[PDB]
Design a protein around this ligand. Structure first.
Ligand SMILES: O=c1[nH]c(=O)c2nn[nH]c2[nH]1
Ligand SMILES: O=c1[nH]c(=O)c2nn[nH]c2[nH]1
Ligand SMILES: O=c1[nH]c(=O)c2nn[nH]c2[nH]1
Ligand SMILES: O=c1[nH]c(=O)c2nn[nH]c2[nH]1
Lengths: 303, 303, 300, 300
């Protein structure tokens, strides 16, 4: 293994070209992105056999300073004329390999830094502000891209993946976990109605990488839309386990977006422990946080 | 100083009585709380001279186990019939002092654990789910209450405070910071148009503590409404500093809620450093995260 | 309330004047600080009635920028000729009030950023390579005011140790507490008590905190080692009982101190396996999040 | 991909069999582990084609509950008769596949929860009181599969040290790098290089990782001390240059290792004061968030 790069390259751009012309789905009102504020956290990794002596001999002759990669990323966000994190990564990668001929491979991660709208009164009415936004520490979109230079100096994308990270969903009822193995290691009680609490990271891959860029936006799959599928399927489903849930979410995603090849899930169980099962004159209950150990599932659904 | 207690007492209740009948303000659509899910993180501190020997002699005869205070809090959330964190704290405090006659003072903090609604399709339409909610790691409401037992065994509230914590607001333009002291310690440039980024914790105190409980909900001041005042004033104001901003927010709060005695602000500056000032054929710019040191302000506005 | 300032002012100084000549105590090997690397995280807060219009009118005429406060602190760490965080805070405080006549009060916190020695090869401690520690760290607090007669006065000073996490595998009990409708906790005659400790002390004479007479300076390193020694020596009956005895020992070792203040938290593990064949050992695991805490002052 | 499991399975064992008889090296005083307190955080992941319907149909017939996996790991720490995290992982892996015939693969991570000795009073290290450390910690990884012939086989094993944060105040340069339209970084012939290191190693013979023959076990404590020694000895020309030399030294000291893998990060401070009167010292501060990193393998 041999690579190096720069992490936590935060870059905030105002007034990126808006994302419009997207194709809608029943589960989501998503219709585009205003891009008044477009925030991204970028990680860049680069490799190539010509970097060996930077490690083995301390020769920096062919070392692009990681500080310079930070400058490269932030300057290119200024000159980017597209509309997606996916397309920004392609722009950075192609530009970087064109600039640095001795680099053979580049890998990029971009993580959205999301901002939400806020209310303001003006000119007689209250409406969403075009100026004041709220930084969100909840779920966020992600993008990943790897690009290589071939022997003939052409550049090729070798992997692309989009995603939604940090989605934390609790469904208060309509979930069971029963019928699992009950042996000498089992102390979990069967539960016909638990408040299942899942953390979800959902990643998708396109059949055709061009559809990830937003250039023909009707072919773009938006993380907002993926979020809303996940919440809708969770609501619709009398869940039998997280495993059961995530497969159903993945099936719906691939049905809604035939241009996707597959969807991958990383789920975690964070379901609360129950403290009060019955409350006089109410269907309510009381729960609290569990001990630290958390279940998890990793699963791919393909077309 | 002598007290002890329990922190991070998470308690989640389903189907608390809804909060309705509130009085509206121009800055906010807030009209109440459904309370399908009501989550609170409680810290309890207790004191009293009769606790001395628990420290000086290792005598636990009069020690309420902190583990038992956790049970006390979680059981009382089950039996609570009111509609606010403020009222829940009063219920816990009065109940605890009534139960433990040797305790002379109790202090409680309650922090909302907020959940947001999500979309689901069902019966032909898409609408907010009554079952699936999204845990939010953004701003949250807070409540504080201190209660004492008097020599005659009556109980009195000695301090009450409500709040909104963790509000992170960025306004992309319409903010200046110019005219500050420029001496041998000054390297900050004057800036006539910066993207001011503030973290805000806003705390308010009522003229009459009863108005905090929600029993007559038209007198309750909701953290949601305070949030929307803050965003509206930020939008409306050509800010001259954070100091200038927070005073204006506080004035609006006290004008909208004459039943409040004062409002207190803890603000932090997290404004990004500018990297690209000019972008061809665009009003946009590029910024990035600053170094760690952060400015802050603490200020009270009173009626 | 009306004040403003700057937090997370990190400053790292190499080769500060070493702290030498400190009085040692039985419990600790501490005898000074080499100060090859001196790291401190400073927070400054300033007040004054003349700041009012910076809020009420947006007038920045009398605003020292918080960014400039950061420069002030960093430049003063370069010119500081002393040997303690406590003394550095006094230097900053006096310099700032002398510079800015419209400021009536200044509050400072300094938190050590600790670095530990490492081995380099015969093996010996390196004088160049250090290990950044995320464990316990020393702290200092100072509040200084301008009086009506233009004299400057320290109104409060406090040193401390923060982030000390100690677990004693045996020799701790918690029994005899109240058992009623809300008590589910079992009594335990031998628990592996795990405590987090923040310990703070005040001097009888604020000058002793500066280190100018090193014999009268109380080092957070020595407080740490007192706490571990007393924990080891004591068959604890509760955290309350433990911290009282720690405080008593500190005050006995440092008669120049007026008080010791404790903030403790209980993080004891849940026991899962009570008996292991042919062993005295047990298996424990992490508890649920709720944590007990205590706050207590011992006075000289 | 199809697997599931349990993370953050904390388990603390008192009085595990001590690790004795380890081979020492010049760079480290390490010679064994008392194991009065043995803390490990385990993550388990399991796979098998027969799990498919637990996803596609909601059939829990063949689901070992992740909660039960937690019980499995904790109970096996109580019955473990060995002396290393690496060996404990092998014990868990083999036991789990032997128990559950429908599981075809198991992956385990174990992360040490480290505790340091403290002083108790003559002053001496306590045998009861320990300090929880949030600094560097040892790690272990193991993957085991069931073959078509029902034999069990370890397909991957890796030990490591994580979270090592080292700063060398002088004796480091970074010069000669590419200078073009994107380069603003100044060359530096004497910088206080601050690196975070995660170091991982693989054995030629997976059995050497278990500790059964302690002479062949490579301790994370010894890797730590090699890293600090090499850092001290080397006039570094970059982090790339440093980690190569660290790797070479590790492989020279432990011929039983096949490779050493590094993940490093640059956290060097920005310099604010270049010269202080009558001192060799300087003042630095924390940089902006973006951090450089390197990843490199050295092979025997
Ligand atoms: O949904 C779940 N899947 C599982 O595998 C599991 N194990 N414990 N709880 C669980 N819940
Ligand atoms: O709004 C601000 N107030 C201040 O006091 C300040 N100081 N630096 N930047 C600042 N911004
Ligand atoms: O030392 C303790 N003091 C306490 O008050 C307490 N309460 N639960 N456990 C406890 N342990
Ligand atoms: O050691 C370093 N290697 C690098 O590649 C680099 N880039 N910026 N600074 C650096 N330091």
């Amino acid at each position: 293994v041999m690579y190096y790069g720069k992490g936590d390259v935060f870059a905030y751009r105002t007034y990126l070209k808006p994302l419009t012309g997207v194709r809608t789905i029943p589960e989501s009102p998503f219709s585009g992105r205003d891009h008044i504020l477009f925030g991204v956290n970028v990680k860049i990794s680069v490799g190539g056999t010509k970097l060996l002596t930077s490690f083995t001999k301390g020769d920096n002759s062919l070392v692009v300073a990681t500080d310079s990669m930070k400058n490269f990323i932030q300057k290119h966000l200024a000159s980017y004329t597209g509309t997606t994190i996916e397309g920004f990564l392609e722009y950075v990668a192609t530009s970087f390999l064109k600039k640095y001929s001795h680099i053979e491979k580049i890998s990029l991660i971009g993580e959205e830094i999301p901002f939400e709208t806020t209310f303001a009164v003006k000119n007689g009415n209250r409406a969403a502000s075009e100026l004041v936004f709220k930084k969100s520490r909840n779920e966020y979109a992600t993008a990943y891209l790897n690009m290589v230079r071939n022997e003939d100096n052409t550049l090729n994308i070798t992997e692309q993946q989009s995603g939604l990270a940090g989605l934390q969903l609790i469904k208060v009822s309509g979930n069971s976990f029963v019928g699992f193995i009950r042996d000498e290691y089992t102390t979990l009680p069967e539960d016909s109605n638990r408040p299942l609490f899942v953390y979800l990271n959902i990643k998708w891959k396109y059949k055709n990488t061009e559809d990830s860029f937003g250039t023909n936006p009707e072919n773009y799959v938006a993380a907002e839309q993926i979020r809303d599928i996940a919440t809708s399927v969770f609501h619709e489903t009398e869940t039998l386990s997280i495993q059961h849930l995530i497969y159903l979410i993945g099936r719906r995603i691939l049905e809604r977006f035939p241009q996707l090849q597959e969807v991958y899930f990383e789920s975690q169980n964070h379901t609360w422990d129950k403290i009060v099962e019955e409350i006089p004159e109410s269907e309510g209950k009381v729960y609290t946080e569990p001990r630290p150990p958390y279940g998890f599932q990793c699963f791919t659904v393909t077309q």
